[PDB]
Structure 1
Amino acid sequence: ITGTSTVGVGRGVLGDQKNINTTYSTYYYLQDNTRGNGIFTYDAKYRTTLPGSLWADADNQFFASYDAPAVDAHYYAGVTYDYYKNVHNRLSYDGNNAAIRSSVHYSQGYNNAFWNGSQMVYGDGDGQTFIPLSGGIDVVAHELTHAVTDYTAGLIYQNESGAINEAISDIFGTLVEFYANKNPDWEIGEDVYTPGISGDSLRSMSDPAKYGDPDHYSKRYTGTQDNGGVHINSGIINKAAYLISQGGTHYGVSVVGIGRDKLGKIFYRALTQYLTPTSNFSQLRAAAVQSATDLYGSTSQEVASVKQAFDAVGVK
């Protein structure tokens, strides 16, 4: 829409009040002109035609319950935008300030969210397994991060390259969570998963096995389900990432944590300069060690921790 940049206010899914960047032209649209070539939020209106219609509001106030998923999808895309730009000097997902678009209210009772090749899509959940999935900043950043991957490494969505693809989204989703610094953790999706059960989550990076995911190569899934276990086997890599940052002793192998900023730096580099569409785990090991070397010296602690971490998850 051509119009003037304005600022609306509303409440997100969890009931928090936030300001959002809107665009005015008769109606107030969920169109943020303050970030790259824009952030654009649409209403799929319980259907599956995408992206749907650019979100339109009469008064620039977004406090209705129907509005809440849109408020959050819009705002957290912005937050994720600023993480990549401020932290990795990356302008949107293609690196050239591509427009970021999101649709909410996708289908009915849809317990998921995803990147479809062109845009982010968020269901409202069935209210039992999930509440609207854009309520989770780690979920939003996970999904936009798939855009980053597709444009960089382009890790094929299957088997080990696919489990790396998923881990990368989980890792950057968490780092963005930490960045906004609101109840951050190394769990995925806890903010919108099972509103009836407290303390749980979709996946854990710190201990993948809490939800049956593997935390060592030797427990890798090799079946055909989940595109070859892309959301399963990512636990092995998420664990490595966790340990690289936070440290610990896993199956008796000790890792000195180097903190999440360095993790972030090492894995963005790996993602942007060494990983390829068909990279496997062992190849990820090599990319990250080289990334760390590039960054802090072949004999740095950073390099040594990265090795320790991959050792601990059984990845040579």
Structure 2
Amino acid sequence: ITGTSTVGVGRGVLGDQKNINTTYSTYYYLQDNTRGNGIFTYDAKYRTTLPGSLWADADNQFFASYDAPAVDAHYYAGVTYDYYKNVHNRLSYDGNNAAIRSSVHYSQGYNNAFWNGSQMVYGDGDGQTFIPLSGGIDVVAHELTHAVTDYTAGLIYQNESGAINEAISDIFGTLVEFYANKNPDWEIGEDVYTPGISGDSLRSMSDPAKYGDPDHYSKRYTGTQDNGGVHINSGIINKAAYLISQGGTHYGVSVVGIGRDKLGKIFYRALTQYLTPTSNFSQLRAAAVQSATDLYGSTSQEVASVKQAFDAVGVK
């Protein structure tokens, strides 16, 4: 909408107070004009019609329980935009400052979040498996990263290419979580998953097998559920990325860690310059090796560590 940029205040899903960029024209709308061509947050009103209504508020204060998922979807989209711009010189998901749209309160008791080809969408959860999913910064950045992938490598959402697509979203979701630097970890979704169980998460990148996901190519899922295991076999790539950054010895193979920032540079370059819609795990290894060669040189530790990490997870 046309209006003037304003700054509201509210509380997110976890009860934390934050300022949000809004737009005033009769109402205060969840429309942040400070980033690209805007970040816009919508109310789906417990239905499945999308996007729903641009979020309108009478007083620019967002402390109601119903407001909390919207506050976080809006704010964490801003953090994610900032990460891509400041760290990778990428302007929004398309590289040309496309408007970023999110809807919250999607459906009833909906235990998921998604990118629908055009926007991000967040369920509220059922209060048992999830609380409102925009409360997880890694979740928000995971969804927005699906948009980045759509506009870059375009990895098809099935089998190995789809597991790479998933892992890219988990990797950058985690790097955004570290960028914001609030309780960062290598787990996925811990802030919104299972409110009645402490210390768990939807997935782990540091130890995927803690939740039955594979951590070695010899343990990959080959069936048809989950689009050929896209959320399962992502553990093999997530583990490789974790090893590149943090190091470790895994199935007897030692990896010298090179840190999160270099992991992010290598995988961002692979995603944007080398991966294609049909890339498989072996092709991802080659793309990561070439990316690290471009950035650091063929004789570098960074290239050696990429090779060690893929060796450790059984990907040649």
- TM-score w.r.t. structure 2 length? 1.00
1:88-124 CA deviation, whole Å, 9 max, x = no partner? 0000000000000000000000000000000000000
Q: In structure 2, how many angstroms separate the alpha carbons of the residues matched to 1:306 and 1:104?
A: 38
Deviation at 1:66, TM superposition (A): 0.1
SS in 1 for 2:242: helix
Unaligned runs of 5+ in 2: none
Q: In structure 1, how many angstroms separate the alpha carbons of the residues matched to 2:101 and 2:21?
A: 14
Q: In structure 1, how many angstroms separate the alpha carbons of the residues matched to 2:182 and 2:222?
A: 36
Mapping for residues 229-308 of structure 1, pairs under 5 Å: 229-308=229-308
1:58-93 CA deviation, whole Å, 9 max, x = no partner? 000000000000000000000000000000000000
Q: In structure 2, how many angstroms separate the alpha carbons of the residues matched to 1:220 and 1:100?
A: 34
SS in 2 for 1:104: strand
SS in 2 for 1:269: helix
Q: In structure 2, how many angstroms separate the alpha carbons of the residues matched to 1:148 and 1:271?
A: 9
Deviation at 1:265, TM superposition (A): 0.2
1:243-295 CA deviation, whole Å, 9 max, x = no partner? 00000000000000000000000000000000000000000000000000000
SS in 2 for 1:165: helix
SS in 2 for 1:117: coil
Q: In structure 2, how many angstroms separate the alpha carbons of the residues matched to 1:116 and 1:286?
A: 30
Q: In structure 1, how many angstroms separate the alpha carbons of the residues matched to 2:221 and 2:130?
A: 26
SS in 1 for 2:7: strand
Q: In structure 2, how many angstroms separate the alpha carbons of the residues matched to 1:137 and 1:178?
A: 10
Deviation at 1:128, TM superposition (A): 0.6
Q: In structure 2, how many angstroms separate the alpha carbons of the residues matched to 1:203 and 1:284?
A: 21
Deviation at 1:165, TM superposition (A): 0.1
Other-structure match for 1:185: 185
SS in 1 for 2:209: helix
SS in 1 for 2:65: coil
1:154-208 CA deviation, whole Å, 9 max, x = no partner? 0000000000000000000000000000000000000000000000000000000
Q: In structure 2, how many angstroms separate the alpha carbons of the residues matched to 1:272 and 1:302?
A: 19
Q: In structure 2, how many angstroms separate the alpha carbons of the residues matched to 1:220 and 1:197?
A: 28
Mapping for residues 32-181 of structure 1, pairs under 5 Å: 32-181=32-181
Report % sequence identity: 100
Deviation at 1:211, TM superposition (A): 0.3
Q: In structure 2, how many angstroms separate the alpha carbons of the residues matched to 1:290 and 1:258?
A: 16
Q: In structure 1, how many angstroms separate the alpha carbons of the residues matched to 2:129 and 2:218?
A: 31
Q: In structure 2, how many angstroms separate the alpha carbons of the residues matched to 1:307 and 1:164?
A: 17
SS in 2 for 1:24: strand
SS in 1 for 2:5: strand
Q: In structure 1, how many angstroms separate the alpha carbons of the residues matched to 2:137 and 2:220?
A: 28
SS in 2 for 1:101: strand
Q: In structure 2, how many angstroms separate the alpha carbons of the residues matched to 1:308 and 1:266?
A: 15
Q: In structure 2, how many angstroms separate the alpha carbons of the residues matched to 1:301 and 1:108?
A: 50
SS in 2 for 1:6: strand
Deviation at 1:210, TM superposition (A): 0.2
Q: In structure 2, how many angstroms separate the alpha carbons of the residues matched to 1:17 and 1:197?
A: 24
Aligned length: 316
Q: In structure 2, how many angstroms separate the alpha carbons of the residues matched to 1:198 and 1:272?
A: 37
SS in 2 for 1:67: helix
SS in 2 for 1:121: strand
Q: In structure 2, how many angstroms separate the alpha carbons of the residues matched to 1:129 and 1:235?
A: 20
Unaligned runs of 5+ in 1: none
Deviation at 1:237, TM superposition (A): 0.1
Deviation at 1:32, TM superposition (A): 0.2
